[PDB]
Amino acid sequence: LHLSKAKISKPAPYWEGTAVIDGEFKELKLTDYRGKYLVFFFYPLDFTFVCPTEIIAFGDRLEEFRSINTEVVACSVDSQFTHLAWINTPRRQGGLGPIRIPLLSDLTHQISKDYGVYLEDSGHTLRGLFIIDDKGILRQITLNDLPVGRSVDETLRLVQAFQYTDKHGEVAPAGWKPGSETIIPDPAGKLKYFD
Amino acid sequence: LHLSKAKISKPAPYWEGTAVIDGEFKELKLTDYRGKYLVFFFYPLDFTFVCPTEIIAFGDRLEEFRSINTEVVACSVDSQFTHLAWINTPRRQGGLGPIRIPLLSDLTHQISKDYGVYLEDSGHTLRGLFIIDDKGILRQITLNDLPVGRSVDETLRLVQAFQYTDKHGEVAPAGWKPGSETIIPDPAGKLKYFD
């Protein structure tokens, strides 16, 4: 039986720990992001394979999140010292190079267990991404098995859709992008859309 | 504390029930899909709002899954009788019209609870999608809060990536599509990619 504190439409489970932020160690906590959307994602291990490509994909596109009031934080079970060393490893060596996303350390595994992403037999997490709104409420959960990375395009579309539906109180159909048709969640009002 | 039987890299929890399949009631079970990938997704309620758009999006693109050895099954807590009535409601009335995807009924809520998608306060599920491989192993889990639909494009990309990595035993970086570069999961072999 799988156990987690992470529930959609409930407050995201609180976390705090040491992150590497612009080459320095800093205390970071979930509530530092109140007032903004947060994309909080776990990756298995520093110095491995799919993991740097995802951090780099989000990092290189960070201004696309920051301009819609959204922050990104990545997390693995490695220490902050390992995070720093990986950052100071050239991208060509499978390193990260300099990076604008905080890398949070979950050495005690408590944060992983709370978000239900810890693999007990391996001692690290799978690829779990969490979208948390400006009120600290968990809106979306995406978990991938180890071999397959996530999509920045898809995360962006999700954040946009949650902020849109937050604002207008209509609902976003399958595949919705900005500029797409939405639905009034009324059995009479829905007919606008379905005609 | 959230509880489920659904664990990535473990066998997907077994299910069986009545589905509507080409306008008829039929017994359907998870293991009927052994040997093929399965996209198994839950939606909140027949005769509601985001729900028909997702069923229709997958349904209208079904041959794109069937040609990569992948089936799709949708599920809600409504009865098979309600599923049939919704199918026999014109798309213009927010109905489904004829549909090639089985609609599985989870009236006892046991299947929802097993997949960890049941909302105890509402009596139906959230938007939870599950990708299960040809061996019955759970590979990917996507859960959306009620207001925001899923993406057929993204589901397809995920299925493709899991089947690719199944076959070649390399790993798929962030945003991977067919034709994209992969990584040899070796600290020496990974350097091919990172150069």
Add this chain to the structure above:
Amino acid sequence: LHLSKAKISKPAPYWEGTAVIDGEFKELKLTDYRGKYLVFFFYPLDFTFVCPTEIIAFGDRLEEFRSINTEVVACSVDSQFTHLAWINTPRRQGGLGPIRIPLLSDLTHQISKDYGVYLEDSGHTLRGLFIIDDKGILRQITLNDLPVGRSVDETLRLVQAFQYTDKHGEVAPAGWKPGSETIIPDPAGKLKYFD
């Protein structure tokens, strides 16, 4: 063992939920009925067979209840959206047509379990009818297996008898209808009836 909170001669178990009333979604509560008798009945499932005939029979004869200060509420495990769709289905198609009885939705199954009528293996209720007096006290319980409908005539006879015996403190013999002999519940007084 079978369990229920519904005990004859004790206050009927409190319920509240969404009902379709006049084609609109309203909160409805058991306490809205204080001051009136209430026939509160569960039926298995919208869009089925015996179920429409029973709802229609009570609806079409509503005045016979209302003119003796009695209201009627029907309940299934279906959603309020499925209720509304059934109401908008013509009677020729097994729909209800417009209806003057509230259709209460018990989607979480709380109400059905409190009344002891929920079938664990099927995920819906059997045919359970409850007669609740104006003080909120449960007077009568009628439970039928699935294939056999209830009787509006028998329900009305029971309501009238509970009303007559509430008022006069005589008791009602077998088959009593308005205009029939009653019995004074005393070893001396009973002799007036039996001679």
Add this chain to the structure above:
Amino acid sequence: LHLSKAKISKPAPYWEGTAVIDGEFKELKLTDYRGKYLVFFFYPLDFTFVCPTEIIAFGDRLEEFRSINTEVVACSVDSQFTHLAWINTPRRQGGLGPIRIPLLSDLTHQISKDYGVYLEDSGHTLRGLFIIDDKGILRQITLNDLPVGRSVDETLRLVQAFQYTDKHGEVAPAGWKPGSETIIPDPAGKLKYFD
């Protein structure tokens, strides 16, 4: 919480006891009735008010049940000796007179408690009636608060309905009597009834 062993669609709870049958004490068992429908009914107390009218009502119309392969048995918490005294009491004194219906004695209360009809505060049953099919399965439960008697007509209508639906596998609409239209419990076949 209210507890009982009696569940519709399951074997009626087994019982055995002393009954008065044609003036004599005999051991009577629920399994004596295999092969026949059984109307099994409890009444509060010998030498009381509604109770003799219900026993007489069923008694005088017994062949109406016996000619549709149905037996009737009555039960109260009173002793076999009290039952026999009551039989030997003239109808004109609230007595029973001779009757063809067995009066089963439930002095220990185990039968009452098994059928969920025992009133802990009072030490006797309410008016509970049970229709049990020829396979020993419970089909119908009718519980009345003390002041209001049951109906022979209605019991007869229900027995006929269960027998018809057993034999023809159609279902019986609200109010159904012999010669009334039934419904084919299929979404297509139902339309013959509804149209």
Add this chain to the structure above:
Amino acid sequence: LHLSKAKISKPAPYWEGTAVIDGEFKELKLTDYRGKYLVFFFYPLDFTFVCPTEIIAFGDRLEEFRSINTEVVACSVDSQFTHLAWINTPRRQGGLGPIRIPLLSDLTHQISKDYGVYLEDSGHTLRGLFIIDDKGILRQITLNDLPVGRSVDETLRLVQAFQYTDKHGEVAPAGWKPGSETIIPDPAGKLKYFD
């Protein structure tokens, strides 16, 4: 393991219920007897064999108790309506005829069980008699198997003996009757009797 609340030397267990007293139903309580001795006895069943002989033997000799400030109450598991019908049955038919002793009803079995005289296999009491003093303390317990009646003479003897020893603080030898020698309960004082 046999259990009861009735202990010699301790307050007799409280009881209350409905008795037939001069043809009427009245609430009777143990505390109604404070200030008087009470012979409180159980008998198995109304309309049986030994039982009317005992009730009639104490009833017909009631003045032998009242003139020594002693009341008599009889109790069985039968309803008060059965007690009244028994009273209205002529002695020649095994009835009681009018009786001056209250007949307490113990339909719920609570009083029988508190007095340790309830027979779980039969659903009624054995023949248990209890002598309770004016202060409410249980002094004497006599329990007989079903086939053998008790003795009014022996009961009188015991009451007279307890009243004598209460008043004079001497003790009553085997077979003591009024006018008989008693013993000063003292290793010195006793010699007055034995010498």
Add this chain to the structure above:
Amino acid sequence: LHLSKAKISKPAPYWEGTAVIDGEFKELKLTDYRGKYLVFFFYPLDFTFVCPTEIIAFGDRLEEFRSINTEVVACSVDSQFTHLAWINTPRRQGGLGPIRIPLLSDLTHQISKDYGVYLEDSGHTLRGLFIIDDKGILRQITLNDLPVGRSVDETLRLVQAFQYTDKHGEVAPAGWKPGSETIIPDPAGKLKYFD
């Protein structure tokens, strides 16, 4: 709560111990008496007051028991050495003198506690007497508070009544003595006695 193993109509609780029999110490067991009725009685303490008079009353009339195939055994918590001293003490000093009834010693209190006659606050028994049949079944229980002794006449009457009803299968009315009428325990048969 008062606890005991002694229950009417159930085998009398097994006992064994050392008794004084014709001035000698002997191993005695309840089962030694199988095949005959036994009057087994407890008295509080050797060298006390009511206690010798009861033992003497039975001892002096022992041939009245023996000639109806009934034995008598007395028991207290005192040791067998105390029993012997008391027997060797002249009747005029509250001693027993020679005696033909066994005096059983219950020094460990096990026998007293099994028979429910032990007084935890005093460390000895009250005056309890038991009538056990030839099959070892307990038929009668008489418990007196300390100040009041038992009756040999009443005990003989009970033994005679049990033996008579054992033999003829009729039952014995209140105050029955040898030569009195008995009752056939049958609703028709009983009318022989009452008419």
Add this chain to the structure above:
Amino acid sequence: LHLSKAKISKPAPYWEGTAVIDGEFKELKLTDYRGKYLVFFFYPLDFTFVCPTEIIAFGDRLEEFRSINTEVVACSVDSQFTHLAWINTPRRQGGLGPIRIPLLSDLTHQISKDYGVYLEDSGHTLRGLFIIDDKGILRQITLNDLPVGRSVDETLRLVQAFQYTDKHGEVAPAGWKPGSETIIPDPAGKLKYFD
């Protein structure tokens, strides 16, 4: 496992009961002896064998205890009435004759069990003796199996030794008697004695 409340150097377990003192029954308590040493001893049974010789041995030499401010109390499970009978029995018949030591009665066994001397299989005590100081602290425990009696000389020697070491704070060597050398309980001080 053997259980007791009596522990050396801890307050002796409180006791109270009825003793025979100069031929009279009197309430005695352990606390009556505060301010003086007490030799408290149990013997198996009145009217037995080693038991009288021990009581007589102490009784005859009681002034040797009294003159060192020490009292003696004896106890068995026998009743106070047995104690008195035994005292009133001449020494030449194994009786005690007059005696100046209280004979405490432990009829309920509580005192024996508290002192750990009670023999569950026999229902009396072994030969146990306790030396309790003026403060109520248990100082010495001597337990003999049944066949072998205690020693007044040895008991006097112990009481004298406890009182001496209580007064001078030195300690008493093996076999110390009044007038023998004692030891200063100090690594240097001890050398006075040993050298």
Add this chain to the structure above:
Amino acid sequence: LHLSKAKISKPAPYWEGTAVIDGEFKELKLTDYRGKYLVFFFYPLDFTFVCPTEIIAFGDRLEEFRSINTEVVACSVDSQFTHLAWINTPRRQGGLGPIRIPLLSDLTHQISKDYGVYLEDSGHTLRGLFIIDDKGILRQITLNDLPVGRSVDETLRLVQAFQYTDKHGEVAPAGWKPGSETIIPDPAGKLKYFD
């Protein structure tokens, strides 16, 4: 609550450990003494005050035990290395000097606790002596508070008494020594002694 395994009449608790025996470490066991009486005694601590006097008093008188087929073993919580250093300390310094009695070491405290002589607040034993017969049954227990030594004379007296009563099946009066009168344990036989 005081606990121990040592009960008079039952096999003495098994023990085994390392003893110093003639200057050497040897494994010693209780069963090594079968066929002989054993005086087994505990003393608090090596290098203390009363303790060497007791060990020396039994050692120096060992032939008084061996010539009646009795061995002596002393035990404390001290290590065997401490026992040996104590032995190699001259008597004049509070040492033992060479000794013919084994000194058992109970470093783990298990033996002390089995014998109920361990003092939890001090971490050593009180002065507890145990007389065990040739069959291994515990016959006698003597426990002294710390400040007061035991008596070799008393110990000899008890051994001689137990051996005499074992052989002759008579019992030993208070103060018995060899050559003293014993008692035939019989209410008749006893008169030979008392008369």
Add this chain to the structure above:
Amino acid sequence: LHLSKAKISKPAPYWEGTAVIDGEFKELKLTDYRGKYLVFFFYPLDFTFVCPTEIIAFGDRLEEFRSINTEVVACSVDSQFTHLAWINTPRRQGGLGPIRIPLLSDLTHQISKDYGVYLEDSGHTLRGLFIIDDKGILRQITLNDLPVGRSVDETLRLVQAFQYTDKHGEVAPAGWKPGSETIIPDPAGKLKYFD
């Protein structure tokens, strides 16, 4: 409370995991070391401060262990990928450089908890060293708080002493080094060392 499975003089707790050996990932097990002494030490974290100096000190002095049949294994909670990256970091940068000691990865924390060295609040181990003999038995445990490194010289001294005492069965005094005096563990033999 602190818990561990590592007990001196008991078999060292089994472990197995992935190690970096010769720059490659290998399964390694405690049982691979049977036949050799093993120094098994935990260090807090790769890429830190005291940790490289200790690993380097043992690595650079490996021959001193291997020439006396002793191997060395280091362990932290870091992944094998972080170990490999640290090994590929030059010593001038706080890396290890190539290394001839296996670096075991304890990512699940199982091994660290089994050895009692895991710090719950920090998510890594303290400085814990374990010396395990050739039979797999744990001989020595050294635990240091974080800021203070261990000593290769002290470890080597300990290994040599355990080897010398395994071989000769003499014992090693404080500060013993090869060539120093040893002690024969006997009270007589020890005198050769101490004179």
Add this chain to the structure above:
Amino acid sequence: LHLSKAKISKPAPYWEGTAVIDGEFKELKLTDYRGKYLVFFFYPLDFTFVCPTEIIAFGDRLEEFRSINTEVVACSVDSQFTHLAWINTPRRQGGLGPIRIPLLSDLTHQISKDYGVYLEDSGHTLRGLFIIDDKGILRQITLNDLPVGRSVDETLRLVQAFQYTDKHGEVAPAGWKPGSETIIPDPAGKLKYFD
């Protein structure tokens, strides 16, 4: 499982006991050492082998600790009396001679068990040494199997290292001694040491 209260980085477990200090018995408490470092060490047994050499080693070099504000205390399960005897034993006989180090006694074993050094099978401690800082915090634990002594030099090196790191907040590399290079525990500042 092995349990202990001693955890590095937490307050050393509190202790108190009798110690021998400069030839005398004194109560000694762990809190007596607040304000100073404390080397607290356990040794198996007085009058044994390695144990005196370790105490002498620390004893003779005491001022080396006392001049760096550090105290030393030794402890074994032996009594204060045995400790004093051992002190009074010439060094040439494996005795201690005078020593300035307190010898604390742990007769009850509570201190040993609290520090996790007690050997349940043997009844004494292994060789466990604990370095406790001036704030009462545990910094270092060294446990040796019985055959191998500890090192004064190494203990001294550790005390100096903890004192240096306390005061300067740098960290001490493997092998560090006074005058050796330390490390600044920061990823940038570390490079001064490593380069």
